[PDB]
Amino acid sequence: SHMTLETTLFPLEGLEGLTASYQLYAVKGLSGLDETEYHKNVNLLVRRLSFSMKAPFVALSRDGEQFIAVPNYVTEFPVDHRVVRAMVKLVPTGEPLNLRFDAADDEYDGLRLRYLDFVLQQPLFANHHLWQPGSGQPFFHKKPLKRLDDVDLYDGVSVRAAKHPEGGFGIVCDARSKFITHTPIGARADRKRLGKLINRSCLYKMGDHWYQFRIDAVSDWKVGEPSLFEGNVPISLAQQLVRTAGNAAPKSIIDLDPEGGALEYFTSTNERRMAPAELCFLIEDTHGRRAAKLQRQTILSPSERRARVNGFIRRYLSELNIGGAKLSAGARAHAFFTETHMPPALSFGNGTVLAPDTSKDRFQAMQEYSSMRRTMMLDKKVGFFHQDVFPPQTLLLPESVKKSWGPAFASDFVGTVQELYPAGGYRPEIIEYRDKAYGGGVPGQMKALLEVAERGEIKSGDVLVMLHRINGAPRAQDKLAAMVCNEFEKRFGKRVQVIHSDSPGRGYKRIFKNDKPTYVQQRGRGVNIKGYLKGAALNKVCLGNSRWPFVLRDPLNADVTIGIDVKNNMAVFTMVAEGGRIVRVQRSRSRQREQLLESQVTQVITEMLSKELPEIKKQVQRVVIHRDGRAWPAEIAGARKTFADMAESGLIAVDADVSVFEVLKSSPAPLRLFSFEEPTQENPKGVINPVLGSWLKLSENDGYICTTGAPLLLQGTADPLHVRKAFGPMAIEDALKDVFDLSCLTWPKPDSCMRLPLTIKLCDIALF
């Protein structure tokens, strides 16, 4: 009975008969709107309405955005809102909307949820042992869980609570972690130490009011010095933290050193405000500093993460009173039986097909399958699906590295390519650029790369360039990698791939051989250079030249899908047709930061398709889109317009049906799924990961797939992937099923489980 899987969905009781929703308004200042700016207006405004008037102000509508008030407001000031900036008139079309939490699935299921959500964390914000970093964030203890030299580990739980699959509403929970340094920033921290920190985030322990904020400006006054005025008499912020302090106000908040730093930041509603440096505690960004003995702490075995969540539910959310003081969370999670998805069968080269076996208990048969994807890809009887010779290549090397270990590395690297893709016959020209001549920063490195390209020294179409790493942290993003791709593709005719000098320059030493210096490999600490050469041959060369190793024999529900991602004013569109036999990626620049226009979406896709349409050997009649993040209604506009138009021409059946979906890799309402194993000694309550194809549908618009799961996880607990329906006619169970199939095309690392579907995974590697 392994199929029996428990969730972190706790049923909710006490809302049977709790209709509490009652009104409606309408927007009028939108006369100049952006199709993307208009939606930053509302949000800044519902916050001021929810946070000033401190009752539930909820706003989640279609087309022209609308707001729910309570009839209980004293004086709303409807036409008197942002008379400061734009003057929206809040037209009261208020029809009493009285929502019940058992109704059939309605469009104001969106509102029934943002209301439940505002009021269910009032008993959590008023607790005292519990602090919330910001609006709608997990709820963390004031007390840390581990001490952990220099820096405190705080545990917590995220509670969001959307629809239930056996009717009604319920609770969703995930544990969480957060790393904060032990000892406040301090009142003998000077001006230069304080600047060195603008735009980190700190935990500001105010009084009993603990929250999080990002630095903006080391202020112009110290803690004691008079800066703002309550009576025009400047008063010192020590004075201000007293005025706003409460009865038994703690010691720290009324005995600050006046000779200490003061920081600035902007409220959740965009107000300027200060905070003493004493009382501010910096959050370790442990992906910023590669603290991999600080990541070996955030990974939580399954039976823990269950026990942490169950413990939090029983201890904090039980007696729970807001007006209607009912609504007790039922403190036994949701469980179902379900059928888990088998892996798809796949097509390797010379028509040999891998299909999972259905005699072996699911487990032993999938480790078989997932290892086959590698052994088959390498085996020369079968091997790559697409076998053919490579068109001309070019490996482009820093001249500092052509003279030191270039040749050894290039020799091994070409060797590695031919033992992986023998049919290609790899043989790349070896060009160089003069990495020491001009500058050594991103400009200059670029001037040398461009100067070489100018000369026409790069014959051939496809290139692989080796570059240098300029700055640390993963949030930096290599502006140089991206920019070499941009210029090389756009001004010259090139499809470019990128590796970096640092990583192989670890795997080569100089030994002295036969009266000459010579470079040979090394395998000590550092990088595993045999594995690195293998993986970079596959990713940068075989995939870089669009030679797919294995491609999904049997068809998906969609006939075409399309990833989309915009981050840092760059948009990325992928496209997967046939079984994976047809794949494109295209890049184009986005006027909005992360948002994309609607004329641009309609165009990029009508041009990226129609190139490939003759190869698609069907009438094409079920298209899907996957969006990385929020799918803004600008985008969804052109999405149907694109395919409606192709429904006229004849490129499609006339009855096409497009569908938009949002893949939440950072899921707004997270969840875990477990299942069980006779409690062994080791494991008191016998909690393992759910088996790899496990899936769960809550609503018609929300479900989770295990793209990562039991047989092939290496350690930790599996993170179900939250997808959310956004438009269009496709069964969400079908969408989850072939998002799982698209996540079994594990191209960059075959024997491993990949969490994202191939569509949006390429969106993420394509912008590094």
Residue numbers in the entry: -1 to 766
From the paper:
Here, we describe a new class of pAgos that uniquely use DNA guides to process RNA targets.
The structure of PliAgo was determined by single wavelength anomalous dispersion (SAD) method with SeMet labeled protein at 3.28 Å resolution followed by extending the final resolution to 3.1 Å with a native crystal. All crystals were formed at nearly identical crystallization conditions and belonged to the same space group, containing one PliAgo or PliAgo-DNA complex per asymmetric unit. A crescent-shaped PliAgo molecule contains the N-terminal-L1-PAZ domains on one side and the L2-MID-PIWI domains on the other side, similar to other eAgos and pAgos such as TtAgo.
